[PDB]
């Protein structure tokens, strides 16, 4: 069931992702991660599909395949990325986090922990509840 | 006042978070428009004429206090900011989208606007409302 979205909640959702945007970016550099956000979403991704291969990055999207091959290869060059041929399908390279990438992904994510915490500790846990239940509405309908 | 977290919404947060995110991006790139949502939020901040904003940013680094200012460089350079004197405060330039930078922030925000609609449609007009006062007080917080 559809109905017509309000004009003020891309506005006051994009708002929120900005603070947290830049909340990110300024914990990673002041904490000398020499990192970007998009670092953090790409070590993210790593981790949480074990094994993925290379082409599953940015799978159901429109994508410049060049650009995240390039990324890829730089964060493999700064020690924080390995891939391994999959045995499956051997024109296939699976990605894995090294022992320090999985370390810096993981600062990264105690930082967007803090920033989350940050955002939502002054609502009520009744307001809390509420917004959960909003997003997931919304989700639960994709 | 700060109350406990509920564990359920950084996960929440996140989920639309990228959602949102992948979906614009795979737009943007589907039509070819060179953009990233930060191109598009700096393009914002500008033509609101917002530089105590813009200048916040870059102060909240340690490290690349220059973040910002290459990105405002950049815009300029594709043409879609320029940049005045100032007619009192001459050691500081203002700030304002070009007549093609209006164009195309206009048209990524129209982008980033239907990706919204699409992703709050299922929400009833009050649970929308409901939604945009809770990310409204959760960022008026902090």
Chains 1, 2 share one sequence.
């Not at 006051?12 to 000398?32: G, K, N, P, Y």
């Not at 991704?45 to 410049?64: P, S, V």
């Amino acid at each position: 069931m559809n109905y017509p979205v309000n004009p003020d909640l891309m506005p006051a959702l994009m708002a929120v992702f900005q603070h947290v945007r830049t909340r990110i970016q300024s914990e990673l550099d002041c904490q000398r991660l020499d990192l970007t956000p998009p670092d953090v979403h790409v070590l993210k991704l790593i981790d949480e599909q074990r094994g993925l291969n290379l082409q599953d990055l940015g799978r159901q999207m429109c994508r410049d395949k060049a650009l995240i091959t390039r990324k890829i290869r730089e964060l493999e060059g700064r020690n924080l990325v390995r891939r391994e041929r999959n045995p499956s399908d051997q024109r296939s390279f699976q990605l894995f986090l090294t022992d320090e990438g999985l370390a810096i992904h993981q600062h990264a994510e105690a930082i967007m922990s803090r920033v989350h915490d940050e955002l939502f500790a002054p609502l009520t846990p009744v307001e809390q509840a509420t917004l959960v239940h909003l997003l997931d509405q919304s989700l639960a309908a994709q």
